[PDB]
């Protein structure tokens, strides 16, 4: 995808993440765990439902039209009736093919983007207290217990509290 996260610096997806589309796994002094990220998951779901609802909205209603099957050879007028219909069908078939190609390219890119946005947001919270290991994981350079991990996950992590400890570990 365009952002290089999904099938990129994130090496693979997690079959064990069964309660969200995007999320976190951690290891700290209290063990390991996993949690779905609700906001990123819902942003992707909401965009996908948005495009689905635009696509499946409003079939056209048509009533009396032209005949499209014929039991006798007639020549010129029938030739034209059949050509008009064949022309119409080929144009709609082209629209249908192109629509799903464009939509699908974009769905892959928007989901890749949501992964990348979560990663960047997490990085920004951590400031100088962590480093990007290059595989979608952050090495956090301070003791970070379950409540600390949850503070990152819920967006209230206070980098200043841990900065002295982390810098000592990173740089000295």
């Amino acid at each position: 995808g365009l952002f290089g996260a999904i099938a990129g610096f994130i090496e693979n997806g997690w079959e064990g993440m069964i309660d969200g589309w995007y999320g976190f796994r951690h290891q700290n002094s209290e063990g390991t765990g996993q949690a779905a990220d609700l906001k990123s998951t819902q942003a992707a779901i909401d965009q996908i439902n948005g495009k689905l609802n635009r696509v499946i909205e409003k079939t056209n209603e048509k009533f009396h039209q032209i005949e499209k099957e014929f039991s006798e050879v007639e020549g010129r007028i029938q030739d034209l009736e059949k050509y008009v219909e064949d022309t119409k069908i080929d144009l709609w078939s082209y629209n249908a093919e192109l629509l799903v190609a464009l939509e699908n390219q974009h769905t892959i890119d928007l989901t890749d983007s949501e992964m990348n946005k979560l990663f960047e947001k997490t990085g920004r919270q951590l400031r100088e207290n962590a480093e990007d290991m290059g595989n979608g994981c952050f090495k956090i350079y301070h003791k970070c217990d379950n409540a600390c991990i949850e503070s990152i996950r819920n967006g209230t992590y206070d980098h200043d509290v841990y900065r002295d400890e982390a810098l000592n570990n990173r740089f000295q």
Partner: antibody
Amino acid sequence: QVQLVQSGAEVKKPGSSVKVSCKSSGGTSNNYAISWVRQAPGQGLDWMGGISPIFGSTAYAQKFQGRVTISADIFSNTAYMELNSLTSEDTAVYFCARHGNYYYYSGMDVWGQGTTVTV
Amino acid sequence: SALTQPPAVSGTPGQRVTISCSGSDSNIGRRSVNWYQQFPGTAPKLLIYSNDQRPSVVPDRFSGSKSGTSASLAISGLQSEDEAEYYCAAWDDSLKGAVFGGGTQLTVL
């Protein structure tokens, strides 16, 4: 402002099945989880399960697993609950309710009017 | 069950009333609590979510809190229109499903 509108009251004989619908009007609910919650006469609320149809999740309460089928039609903006092998223990009002987001943890903030099923 | 509430609470107009909700580690302990209000024959209404968060349409006299494996709904300044059934709720990680308390009937004296 979305409203959830449920199908009408049902009278059922023992062993039969009932399928209740929940239509999201005034907007779609396809990007949210909708749960089904029942309330037996004089009793409390009881979760049956839910569905989040774009996300692709259907969940069931263990106590109803195998007897209930929850489904959705994203094109008509409708969710469904089908409960099989009915007995008098299933006489209850059945509600559909939409969660604040795509999954079942969030508070249920939009509720249907309820559907009475009498067995 | 799973969550346990007193069957009944009462108060006078203007009084402060509290409704307790006892759970376990698999629900209230590790998950967020929601509270619902229900008038007879009508659908429940969301009153509190995420433990202490209040929807904009819900009066500020309603508040919620969570400590340990317990939760509490407080109604400051009780009004007559608050006579209703109240339910606590949370996800349970052991049952892998949503659970509710048995409900508390609030009577305005």
